From a paper:
LCs were distributed in two groups: a set of eight amyloidogenic LCs responsible for severe cardiac involvement and symptoms in patients (hereafter, H LC), and a set of five non amyloidogenic LCs isolated from patients affected by multiple myeloma for which no amyloid aggregation or proteotoxicity was observed in patients (hereafter, M LC). Five H LCs (H3, H6, H7, H9 and H10) and two M LCs (M7 and M8) were successfully crystallized and their 3D-structures solved. The crystal structures were all refined to satisfactory refinement parameters; in all cases the LCs were dimeric, with an overall quaternary arrangement closely matching that of the previously reported LC dimers. VL and CL domains display very different structural properties in the seven crystal structures.
The linker regions connecting VL and CL domains (residues 110–115) allow evident variability in the mutual orientation of VL and CL domains, which is described by the elbow angles spanning from 107.99° (H7) to 157.36° (M8). Despite these fine differences, all the structures here presented, except for M8, display an overall conserved VL–VL quaternary assembly and association interface. As for the other structures, in one VL domain of M8 strands 3, 4, 7 and 8 participate to the dimeric interface, while only strands 1 and 8 of the facing/rotated VL domain provide association contacts. At the protein concentration required for Near-UV experiments four LCs (H10, M2, M8, M10) precipitated before the unfolding process was complete, thus Tmapp could not be determined.
Numbering used by the authors:
A (entry chain B): 2 to 213
B (entry chain A): 1 to 213
Write the structure that this text describes.
Amino acid sequence: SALTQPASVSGSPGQSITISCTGTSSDVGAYNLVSWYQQHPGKTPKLLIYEVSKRPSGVSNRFSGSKSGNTASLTISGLQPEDEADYYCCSNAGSYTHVFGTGTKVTVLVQPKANPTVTLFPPSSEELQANKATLVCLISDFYPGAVTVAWKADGSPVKAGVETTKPSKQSNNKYAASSYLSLTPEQWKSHRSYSCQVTHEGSTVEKTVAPT
Amino acid sequence: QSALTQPASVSGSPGQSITISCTGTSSDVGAYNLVSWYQQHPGKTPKLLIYEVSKRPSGVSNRFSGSKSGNTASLTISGLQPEDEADYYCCSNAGSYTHVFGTGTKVTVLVQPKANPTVTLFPPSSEELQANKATLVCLISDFYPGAVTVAWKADGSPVKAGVETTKPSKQSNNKYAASSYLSLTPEQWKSHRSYSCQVTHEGSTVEKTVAPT
Ligand code: NA
Ligand code: NA
């Protein structure tokens, strides 16, 4: 069973952050064999900590590790922009078996937090004339680069047919993403409205669209 | 702190060949002819595939082969089959009585054919126009691999100002999706006769056109 980590955390340059990683008494709690890895996208992982608290040669002392019960912790002090990466824990579940955490993305805040602009598009006429009814929810100009998207039909949940893209930085150094909802024309015309609800930093924006 | 470095995961198509790498040091992989390879399916006991770099036990298919060069060892799986989907681990002697193991590689077996993108061009929405904005969205979906080139036109003429295109991301069907949006004022939108989104993917081109109404 995988080890449990928070999906993300953020801090300002110079701050201290802490990442926790929770397992069971058969792995994290059974041995002092917890290791921490830093991975930038596309690069091989770098070992930061091994055996709970030991640093390999050449690893900065800004990184420290500890453990209490079935939870191991990685602390990063003096947060620097180069520390923006994915961090995952690893632990022995036995002599040869290892279990891995799900990874925590560390965001180093390089600009003010920005709530997203949300623009919802009904199906185009070309689309409906072709018996398609895809809706697109454009989400732009937000920071940091994480949002939660939920669709609705007449104020009821809709989970099937939804695809949301991973946020990516645009030219204004803010993040953009889109979510689209594949619908048949019958679904589109049988409801009074469809809604795209976008949540960012606990704040929620909902846009609504209706057949015409 | 020692471990043999393996890529976390690779993937290949049925029938093709893949090669896993296993990087050690001059004191283990590079020092001896004693690299082994194991295959493990979830919840099952590991199976020795290769020992002493390239020797194959009886009962192991000859589709598995091992080699090494310098401080890096390699396992090759020819004629990839669905049953080959598993975790693969390398190990090497670090000395007479010591051994180092690898971090493991998940081998996923999945057909991933090329696919040209579906392109849907959206004109400005009503609420957007009443807020004095007229963004156009070009939805680009269901393509593989994850690289496209988007070009916008107005009146058949190239337009690069005010366009943003998201980095393509893999969707639930293992194909990629992205969107390109063009930021206009309502006045710009109405002052043109035509707007077009042209998507290029592997020597294939799709152009969609929309006009104000
Ligand atoms: Na113009
Ligand atoms: Na045009």
